[PDB]
A paper describes a structure:
[name] (BAV) is the prototype Seadornavirus, a class of reoviruses for which there has been little structural study. Here, we report atomic cryo-EM structures of three states of BAV virions—surrounded by 120 spikes (full virions), 60 spikes (partial virions), or no spikes (cores). In the full and partial BAV virions, genomic dsRNA segments and a number of RNA-dependent RNA polymerases (RdRps, VP1) are packaged in a double-layered icosahedral capsid consisting of three proteins ([name], [name], and [name]). The spikes protruding from the outer capsid shell are heterohexamers composed of a VP4 trimer capped by a VP9 trimer.
To experimentally evaluate the significance of the electrostatic interactions between the VP4 trimer and [name], we treated BAV virions with alkaline buffer (pH > 10). Negatively stained images of treated particles showed smooth BAV cores, and compositional analysis by SDS-PAGE revealed that VP4 and VP9 were dissociated from the virions after alkaline treatment, suggesting that high pH treatment could indeed disrupt the VP4–[name] interactions. Because the electrostatic attraction between [name] and VP4 is weakened at high pH, BAV core particles can be conveniently obtained by alkaline treatment of BAV particles. Cryo-EM analysis of the BAV core was performed using a similar procedure to that for the full and partial BAV particles. The core particles are DLPs with a diameter of ~70 nm. The spikes have been completely removed, and the upper domains of [name] trimers are fully exposed. Accompanying the dissociation of spikes, the fivefold channel for exporting mRNA transcripts has been widened, and residues near the fivefold axis moved outward. VP10A near the fivefold channel moves more than VP10B. Negative-staining TEM showed that there were separately distributed “fibers” surrounding the incubated core particles, also indicating that the alkaline-treated virus particles were transcriptionally active.
Residue numbers in the entry:
A (entry chain B): 353 to 403
B (entry chain H), D (entry chain J): 2 to 302
C (entry chain F), E (entry chain K): 2 to 299
F (entry chain P): 1 to 249
G (entry chain Q): 1 to 236
The structure:
Amino acid sequence: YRPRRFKEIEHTHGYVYRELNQGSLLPLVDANLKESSSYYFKKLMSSISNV
Amino acid sequence: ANRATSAFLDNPHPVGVNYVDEGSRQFVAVAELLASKLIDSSRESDESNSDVPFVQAYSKFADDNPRHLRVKTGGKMANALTNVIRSYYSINAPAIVPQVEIDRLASKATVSGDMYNSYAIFNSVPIVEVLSPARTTVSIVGSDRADVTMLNTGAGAANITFNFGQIAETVILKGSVPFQLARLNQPMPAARFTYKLRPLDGPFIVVLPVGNPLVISATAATRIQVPLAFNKALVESGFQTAMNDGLFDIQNVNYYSSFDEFIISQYHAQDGINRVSTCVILGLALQAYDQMRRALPVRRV
Amino acid sequence: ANRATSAFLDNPHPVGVNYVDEGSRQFVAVAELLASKLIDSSRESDESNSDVPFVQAYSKFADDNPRHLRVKTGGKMANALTNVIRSYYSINAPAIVPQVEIDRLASKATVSGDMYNSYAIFNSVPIVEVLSPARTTVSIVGSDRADVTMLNTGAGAANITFNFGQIAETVILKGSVPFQLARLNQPMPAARFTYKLRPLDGPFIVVLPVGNPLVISATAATRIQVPLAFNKALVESGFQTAMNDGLFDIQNVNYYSSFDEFIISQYHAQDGINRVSTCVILGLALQAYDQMRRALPV
Amino acid sequence: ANRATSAFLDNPHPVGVNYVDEGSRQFVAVAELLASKLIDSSRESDESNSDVPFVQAYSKFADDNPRHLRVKTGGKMANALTNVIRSYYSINAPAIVPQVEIDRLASKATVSGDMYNSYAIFNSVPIVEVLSPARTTVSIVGSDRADVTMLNTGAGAANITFNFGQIAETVILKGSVPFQLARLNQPMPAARFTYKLRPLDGPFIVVLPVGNPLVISATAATRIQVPLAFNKALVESGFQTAMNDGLFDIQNVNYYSSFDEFIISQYHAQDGINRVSTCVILGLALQAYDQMRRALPVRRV
Amino acid sequence: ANRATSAFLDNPHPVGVNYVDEGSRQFVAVAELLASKLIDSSRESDESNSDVPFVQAYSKFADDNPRHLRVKTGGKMANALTNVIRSYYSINAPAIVPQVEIDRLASKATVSGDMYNSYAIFNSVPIVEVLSPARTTVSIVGSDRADVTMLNTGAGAANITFNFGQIAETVILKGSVPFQLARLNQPMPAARFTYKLRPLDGPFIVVLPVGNPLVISATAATRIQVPLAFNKALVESGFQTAMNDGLFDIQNVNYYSSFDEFIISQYHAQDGINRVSTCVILGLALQAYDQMRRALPV
Amino acid sequence: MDVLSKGSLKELLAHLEKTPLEEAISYRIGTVPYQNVLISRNEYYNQLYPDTTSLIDGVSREGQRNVNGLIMSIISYVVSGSGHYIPNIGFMLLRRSILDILTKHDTGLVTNNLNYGIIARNLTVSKMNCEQRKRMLICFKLLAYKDGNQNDYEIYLNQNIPLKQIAPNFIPGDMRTVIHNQDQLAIVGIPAYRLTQSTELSIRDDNAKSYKLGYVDWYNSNSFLRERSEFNLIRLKDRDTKYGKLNGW
Amino acid sequence: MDVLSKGSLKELLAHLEKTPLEEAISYRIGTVPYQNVLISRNEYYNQLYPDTTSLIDGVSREGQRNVNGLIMSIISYVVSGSGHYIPNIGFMLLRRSILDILTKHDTGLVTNNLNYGIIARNLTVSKMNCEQRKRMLICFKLLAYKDGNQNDYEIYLNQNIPLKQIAPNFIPGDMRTVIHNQDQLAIVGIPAYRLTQSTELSIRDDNAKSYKLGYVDWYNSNSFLRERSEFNLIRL
């Protein structure tokens, strides 16, 4: 895979602001998920369209 | 008649004359900066129980992501850094890395590349020459602390001449028993335990009586211009790793116990001022080699 | 035939076989991490004028709030760290700390106790034996820098055998005057100041001329796998503190000047490989002991 | 008078008596099956340019998802397999694998530890003894193809007795020149180049004429019961890998050039029926070792 | 003193230095993969009574449809595969096939050109030199199994020095009668039938008593890094076919009975590690050549 | 595994009541107890790893036929999970419970001449952890009370200061002492820390981690007994009750 | 990079017309060639890897100041992308383009009395591939036809059969042969898919791979950086 080229002006003088921090899901994950699991499972079942 | 000299000061081999331009210096400084990021990312990855911090740092360092079923050694950046370290040590070592690779690698970071921002103190004591009379035996042992043991048999008041060179800044002399020491054509002062000397003052004469061997312990301090990122602990550790891996196993070269003896021996040779500039760049490269090699450990006993 | 050996290599005492599992290794790594934050909290206490950064870090370390009434000791973590160090040194030391307490203390931080992800360079010079003829006198002095002084009083030159072991990676020999060293069954080289040797190749023969004494200075480098959080400067300081505090005071043990001598001496035992793993964990614990005891002196 | 015997048949060391039960055989069979998937998945991963098939197969073999920095070696299954291989070779082996680990590993796949489903042909020539008269010289060289060179210096024709044992099924004899051979107390036939013999028939007598030496080349075929997954090519490679890695360096053991020589030597010993059963399990375990180590290389040169 | 050496270790000719880059290595891996599909498709064509599977396989390999009147050479891939094999053997080969052809053929399939992900054992016995005194006659026969025949006509027992190089990992040494063998500067042990030796730990000495000749058989194993798809059965068959087909008929080269002799001889040159990688790539090419030629005989 | 998961004294003593002595015997040949061996640990080193075999391990080992060996095999079962190979024990002894062997006179075993110092050396005590040592002291106390050598138990405890501090406090004949005990004696259990599937160096450590990882799998298996979710399905005998009492006591 | 990217005889000859001799030579001393050295390849082996330094490695090496040194530097630039260190060539020859040095009489350089066998041996023709061999023969033919030594060029090709098979099909004086030539001479180029960022064993192979990997980035980001320096300057 390769990215598509921009306009010629943007290649010669173009600049872009980017953030390299990817983050982590551990703070949300790291908990006693015993009671919140049932509520999350109900939302999970509803995500996929039901016959 | 008899002459004695320090072991580490004898026959300093020439250093490499390659990879000393501004672009090559920027490459070494980039390697040190990115190797440091590798060490911190490994610590973060260990604490976070994830490979995300290490992958980002390795990808920046090696232009490739870490690969499964394939040892991670550092890619082309590691290959270029290892070969230039070999080239810095001796002229006999070849020049293998092309200029295109260095310019590509030097553009990864935004380092200054200055090699004269700061200073460092080196503790190797240079004893260039100790001249002794016919019935006196003199022995020089040590590099960080030189122990000179002198015995006089017969007659009396043998005169021993000390030549510490001209590069060292200050030299401190300590004796087992108080002794007399003064410069050339100067009166001898009362015997005392310790002396503070400037090596540029001139040759130093020490009076040695009969019997009762007198041992003089000498410590020296020398200042050399080094970058701000210079860290002597990392450089010395990198020096031992390079010696163990065999990067310095070149023909017609001299081997030293530490980077301190290496830089001092090259400084005391002829045209030693221009040798030191190459040695400092070798020190920064060995600093990067140490941090990179600890982050990625290939060798397993 | 006179046989001379390094002083620190003799009679290595057995090390402890406890607190080397995965859970215990995580406890030592947690202690190192939490003791590091405790030291840093002092600097973060100076940027402001409050003690909240120090109180916050102490509570994490000790599971209890600091109080002006009593001397800050370190809580349950201090007792566990102190006792675990004693069990590492000798097999006679009891394993007082329960595993339930260690498991609880290991859950404070999310570090992984991998002790084989880096390496360190150790500068102790192993001289297993120096064999000399009858007329010669040989004296070996020092560990970090081995000064071997040899004097020949016989009519002819003597051959002296050097055995540097089979563990050290490289050994560098520097002499006061040029000398000739060759491996067994190899022709003698010309006199040089410096020799670089690989100990695995074989014993070395040194020619001793008749006359003035010859002194050889030896420096060795050995690579030992260590955790990435290893700090040799911090480990050495903790070793001196533990020795002074009496953590190593137990019958039928050997005492060493530095952790460099301790780990090399254990490595050169009959089965020294298994001792090195325990010694490395002791060093990491000693590193945490140094940081914690400096913040909280008793 | 003179007695000559094959080198590989002398003093077979005792084999292990552990891990020979039904549950242990299942553990060995499971290891071979999962190691085969490991090799196949690695080939498929290369073709499809994705590490998913290998990561999925390694997860079944090692019960863990590998991290990038940590070297992949097989985990507990590799540790158990390597130590069990040592226990089979000699009695002196520690045999330090718990039964809980064996039971858990055997439950990964639904396979049967049947070591008597099929057979294999082992071509190692057993020469138990070759008895010769005083003025004749006999030398035995080789194991896969034994070349017996006999020279008659005596005045008249000599009779040399061949004892091939009783385990082998078929032995084919060829000579440099046509020679005479017959069973004990039976007429001597005409000189022929080739003889086909049943080793159970009895000691065989060969006539050595005076003059040029006669060299007899020997080839044997022995059939031993082995599992249906047995592959002689993979077993031999695993035997060499185990020998090189140092798994067989136990005190008071005999070292053999091939698994062919190992299994035949234990067969030609007292209680050899029971020894062969253990050696067969070692063969399949060695087959698992070769496949697993080829997919997970650790040693570098 | 008399010197005896293995025949297959004498004068290894230089190997080619072309088609060893990543692009060329991918081409060889693609050739092996497509050759295997060619053999499989022909078997499927025979089973199903239809030529459809073979037509698809030949179309991909040769970039053209099979024809009844024309001959099945294999297309441009067959010509390139033969040419690269010629260049690998000797440095005097033309090496004519251009890069644009190599890249266009590596793009047919997606396989990495990694040549270090596995290993193979080569059972060739390197006997660099067998030094023998006067009156003692030593003969070395064989490569896969080296039989050394020695006998002494002198009054006393002689010492025979064995050198197996520094590349082989283990050498198992079996004698016709029990014999004593020990390393340099080591006591001689009791006579025994078999010996296991690491070739690295110096030369070995065998005591040869006066009397009947002593015949000693040697077996060695060496591990060389090879690709995953390596198959010694296929490689050896391809080696014989290429030699039969004249692909190796180049002036000033040596010839070998089998591929393992070739790879060990080149390993034991002055700098043998250079040639091992080139020899390994040649082995995979021969494996592809064997599979293609068996499917498409000429 | 089941024995190593017992946390309280009540649970451990109850388990020793149900378990017959045959589970302490191994029926597997094993190897010699004390021997210096070279083992393979390829995850860390290429060179073989030296170690010394010991009686306290998860593997069978050869044990002496006398009453000393039988006692040692019982202790090794409690502290390591695997016993020793003692050939040809009568069927009467094998069907008896472990607690009956240690605390009853009906069995024909004579234990009056047992020396606690010798046993502690054979079942290496310098190598055990705190929980393993506590379990051993429970077995020693039961033997002392059955034999009347309660003084010999005290002299042994006074000769070893650390053992006296951690010695479990209960009366082998009173159930009220057992209920009041707060000691934790669980070698294996659910780990608060992160437990991986990596191997360990020592034989004892690697064997212990095999039991630790096995218990986690056994925890999530269908054989595990969940009190909070299936308490009504349990038999009345095995249900957790406050008035549960050992036989006698 | 630009010279190695040219894939046709027309493009190669056009590039040599616009390129001064300064680009062919280098100002870095480098090391002496033909030296058996041990280099570090930690991707594959723990031990050091033997190799021999050559003039076609892609790294500047010391060269003499005679006519042969200048010709060898030019050929190395064409086939490896980097030239050698010839001290103090002079401004007169540096301003001239490479083609004039090869195919003109106004440079003041006597390129006669040149032995192609000796030059080929020094450049390690046995180690260069088909494209590098083709480029070397192009330089030889231009030199031969300018000095009227077409017979010596044919004699050299007859002695070397492998080089005769892949000899270029153009005649230096005829333009029709140049336009109709179909040789492919591109050492580097933008590849379909990509190539792994992995090292190679040989000095030549690794240096060549470094050129291929960096060509894509050089292709995109060269126009502006070159223009900034080119602006407000006069060409040599």
